[PDB]
């Protein structure tokens, strides 16, 4: 399976614009990931990381994005917050693994890397694995509005990038390796 292609990718999207890579019809080697020091966080929900090699799935979805370290914790079931509610939500259910690493020497810059954005205003929260990449000036009561007039605010903001690259493996023809 094309795991390295996702984790060691040279470019990641914003959280609000998280990208979904589908893994299927392949052998999922989780040993490289499991005991590597690449990741600062290796969190699985109801799934034993050690046993990932022994689990078969219809498919695996690797959701890729860059989020400030502080908000990495929002990428989990049962969470609230600007990211959990407006940028990228995980369902209240079992989950595969949320894998993340520090990217201060990759994505962060001395003046702040503001190429990455996030949502903070929206007419309601996001559903689990919903992607909202629209950019229409926010209006608190559904009215038409034009910025920078009063009550007219852009729903998106910029990240003051320390950033972490996060890849979420959501589990639904893919299995781990066999040993000869």
């Amino acid at each position: 399976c094309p795991f390295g292609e996702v984790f060691n990718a040279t470019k990641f999207p914003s959280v609000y614009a998280w990208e979904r890579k589908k893994i299927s019809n392949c052998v999922a080697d989780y040993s490289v990931l499991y005991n590597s020091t690449f990741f600062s966080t290796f969190k699985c929900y109801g799934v034993s990381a050690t046993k990932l090699n022994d689990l078969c799935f219809s498919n695996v979805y690797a959701d890729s994005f860059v989020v400030k370290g502080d908000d990495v914790r929002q990428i989990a079931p049962g969470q609230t917050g600007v990211i959990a509610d407006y940028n990228y939500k995980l369902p209240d259910d079992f989950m595969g693994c949320v894998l993340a690493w520090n990217t201060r020497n990759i994505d962060a810059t001395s003046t702040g890397n503001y190429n990455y954005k996030y949502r903070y205003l929206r007419h309601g929260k996001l559903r689990p694995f919903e992607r909202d990449i629209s950019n229409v000036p926010f209006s608190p009561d559904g009215k038409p509005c034009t910025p920078p007039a009063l009550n007219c605010y852009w729903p998106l903001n910029d990240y003051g990038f320390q950033p972490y690259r996060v890849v979420v493996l959501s589990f639904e023809t893919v299995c781990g390796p066999k040993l000869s």
Partner: antibody, heavy 123, light 110 residues
Framework: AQLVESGGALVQPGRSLRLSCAAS????????MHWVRQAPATGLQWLAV????????FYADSVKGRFTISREDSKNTLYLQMDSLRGEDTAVYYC????????????????????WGQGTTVA | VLTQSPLSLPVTLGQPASISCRSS???????????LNWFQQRPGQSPRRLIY???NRDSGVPDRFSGSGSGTDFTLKISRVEAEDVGVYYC?????????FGQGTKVEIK
């Protein structure tokens, strides 16, 4: 969480008045701040909110463009700048915030409004 | 827009009372919750919250205060009204911006 209003006065229509509200018992910087006024005409009427970072300012249509909400975190003080005052603006102005900032983002800072000051009269 | 009833509640000391609040629109928010709170303003004092999220009470609030409701129709209930309960009971909605209050119900002790 204690809020203390001041700056109330009698001001002729067309003129301006600026209110202030000192905060104590909590960290001012960590909460959004609101102004609400009281009068027989409206009962309790929400006017404006300024977010914790002082960036987003939302106003009721009834004051939108006439009132400006601002804050000085360094003084733990909330302000309200009211221009072109009318007779209809006669009310007791209350300084309002929240104790629970678990969800410090729009619109969740309108959900509790559980911290009120003593209120100051503006006429 | 919130409307309360009665405008004034004449309750004999030690007897129960209830204050109604009716919204022009459902107060259920986008997350499924309902942000309908109740406040009491005692003469000479500012408003204080008693009940929140329709039926929950704040710490320090007497157990005699409770409530119920859904959609547009909400009620604040007082199992027994004491002399110290004199004041104007307001309902407030934060579900739809701008947040609004009812006109308030003046509860007095007879």
């Amino acid at each position: 969480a204690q809020l203390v209003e001041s700056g109330g006065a009698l001001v002729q229509p067309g003129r301006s008045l600026r209110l202030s509200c000192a905060a104590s018992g909590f960290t001012f910087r960590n909460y959004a701040m609101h102004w609400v006024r009281q009068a027989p005409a409206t009962g309790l009427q929400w006017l404006a909110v300024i977010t914790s970072d002082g960036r987003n300012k939302f106003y009721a249509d009834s004051v939108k463009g006439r009132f400006t909400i601002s804050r000085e975190d360094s003084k733990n003080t909330l302000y309200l700048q009211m221009d072109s005052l009318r007779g209809e603006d006669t009310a007791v102005y209350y300084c309002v915030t929240q104790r629970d900032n678990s969800r410090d983002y729009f619109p969740h800072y309108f959900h509790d409004m559980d911290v009120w000051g003593q209120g100051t009269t503006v006429a | 827009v919130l409307t309360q009833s009665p405008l004034s509640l004449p309750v004999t000391l030690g007897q129960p009372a209830s204050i109604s609040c009716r919204s022009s629109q459902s107060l259920v928010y986008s997350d499924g919750d309902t942000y309908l709170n109740w406040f009491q303003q005692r003469p000479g004092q500012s408003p204080r919250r008693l009940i929140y999220q329709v039926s929950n009470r704040d710490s320090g609030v007497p157990d005699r205060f409770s409530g119920s409701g859904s959609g547009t129709d909400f009620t604040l209930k007082i199992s027994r009204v004491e002399a110290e309960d004199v004041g104007v009971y307001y309902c407030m909605q934060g579900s739809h911006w701008p947040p609004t209050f009812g006109q308030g119900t003046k509860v007095e002790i007879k």
